[PDB]
Design an enzyme around this catalytic site. Structure first.
Site, mmCIF file in Angstrom:
data_model
loop_
_atom_site.group_PDB
_atom_site.id
_atom_site.type_symbol
_atom_site.label_atom_id
_atom_site.label_comp_id
_atom_site.label_asym_id
_atom_site.label_seq_id
_atom_site.Cartn_x
_atom_site.Cartn_y
_atom_site.Cartn_z
ATOM 1 N N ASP A 139 0.876 -1.216 0.000
ATOM 2 C CA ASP A 139 0.000 0.000 0.000
ATOM 3 C C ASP A 139 0.895 1.243 0.000
ATOM 4 O OD1 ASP A 139 -2.855 0.973 0.187
ATOM 5 O OD2 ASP A 139 -1.931 2.053 1.874
ATOM 6 N N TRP A 140 0.626 2.246 0.838
ATOM 7 C CA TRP A 140 1.478 3.420 0.814
ATOM 8 C C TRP A 140 2.887 3.117 1.260
ATOM 9 C CZ3 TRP A 140 1.056 7.515 -1.842
ATOM 10 C CH2 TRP A 140 -0.209 7.927 -2.286
ATOM 11 N N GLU B 145 -0.002 -5.923 -3.086
ATOM 12 C CA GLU B 145 -1.099 -4.920 -3.089
ATOM 13 C C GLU B 145 -0.498 -3.505 -3.060
ATOM 14 O OE1 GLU B 145 -4.428 -6.733 -4.225
ATOM 15 O OE2 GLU B 145 -4.687 -4.843 -3.187
ATOM 16 N N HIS C 81 -7.145 -6.793 0.047
ATOM 17 C CA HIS C 81 -6.061 -5.826 0.083
ATOM 18 C C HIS C 81 -5.073 -6.070 1.213
ATOM 19 C CE1 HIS C 81 -3.900 -2.128 -0.737
ATOM 20 N NE2 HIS C 81 -4.150 -1.705 0.492
HETATM 21 CL CL LIG Z 1 -5.270 5.453 0.808
#
Ligand SMILES: [Cl-]
Ligand SMILES: [Mg+2]
Ligand SMILES: [Mg+2]
Ligand SMILES: [Mg+2]
Ligand SMILES: [Mg+2]
Length: 291
Positions: free
Chosen positions: A103-104, A127, A269
């Site tokens: 993710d980030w 992801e 996710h």
């Molecule tokens: Cl986000």
């Protein structure tokens, strides 16, 4: 799947703020740096780290404004996170690393790798963030919510006032039901609405249809780098997935150099909450070959 967080807290001062991190495993060798994303913390890695710690140092920071890290008065844009993670890595004196990112955390990790390629011995990811040219190509599941998160006024009510990234997105993006104990660990940093700025800024930074332009350009740049880099890569993916459904894992297999992929079973996710043992055991098996 364990719910406890049995890691002694470590803190380091970074640009005037304390950042919390997990630090376990041997004191020599290449360290493995685990980077969470939105709206999680090092807690997301709690069941993965014990598979890696027997052989390698594991470092898992809480990003600024998240987890047990401090809450400076920032906008919490991607560029703020970049500054604090860069300073965290230097404050620990890390030289070479293996990245494990999501993710980030994946945008942070790939951006750091492109800028410091000599120091990255391998990247495990899942992801992850890439530029999405149109909303039609954004994942359909929860798409209208992401559109609303990026809509003026509406998005702040959803995320800041209603805490929807924690209460709705997070459990919806795990196939198995998260327990109340796990939810309470994720809720803890955000019990007051005034602590929730990072959770709202993050979806407003996602690179979609060229905006915001600065994040879009940096993500395009690290994706060009990833497609040309010889670094060993390990991608974990689940089904049906969110950002990386099976057809996207296939495109990765057909395009990225030096890639191994691992299917984790059912997953959306936050794959770490669906199958942490496959993730941690396969990272552990892959690390020795990074020389
Ligand atoms: Cl986000
Ligand atoms: Mg202080
Ligand atoms: Mg220690
Ligand atoms: Mg604190
Ligand atoms: Mg299963």
């Amino acid at each position: 799947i364990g719910t406890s967080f049995p890691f002694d807290p470590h803190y380091v001062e970074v640009l005037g703020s304390r950042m919390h991190y997990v630090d376990v495993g041997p004191r020599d060798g290449t360290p493995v740096l685990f980077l969470h994303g939105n709206p999680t913390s090092s807690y997301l890695w709690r069941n993965i780290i014990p598979h890696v710690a027997p052989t390698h140092r594991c470092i898992a920071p809480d990003l600024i404004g998240m987890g047990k890290s401090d809450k400076p008065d920032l906008d919490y844009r991607f560029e703020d996170h970049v500054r604090y993670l860069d300073a965290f890595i230097e404050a620990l004196g890390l030289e070479d690393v293996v990245l494990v990112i999501h993710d980030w955390g994946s945008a942070l990790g790939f951006h750091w790798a492109r800028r410091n390629p000599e120091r990255v011995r391998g990247i495990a990811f899942m992801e992850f963030i890439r530029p999405i040219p149109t909303w039609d190509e954004w994942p359909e599941f929860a798409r209208e919510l992401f559109k609303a998160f990026r809509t003026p006024g509406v998005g702040r009510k959803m995320i800041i006032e209603q805490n929807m990234f924690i209460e709705q997105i997070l459990p919806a993006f795990v196939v198995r039901p998260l327990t109340e104990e796990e939810m309470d660990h994720y809720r803890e940093p955000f019990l007051k609405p005034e602590w929730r700025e990072p959770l709202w800024r993050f979806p407003n930074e996602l690179p979609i249809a060229g905006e915001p332009a600065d994040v879009w350009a940096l993500v395009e740049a690290y994706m060009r780098w990833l497609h040309q880099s010889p670094v060993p890569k390990l991608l974990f993916w689940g089904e049906p997935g969110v950002l990386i459904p099976p057809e996207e894992a296939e495109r990765c297999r057909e395009s990225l150099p030096n890639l191994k992929t691992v299917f984790i079973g059912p997953g959306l996710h936050y794959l770490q909450e669906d199958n942490p043992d496959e993730i941690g055991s396969e990272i552990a098996r892959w690390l020795p070959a990074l020389h």
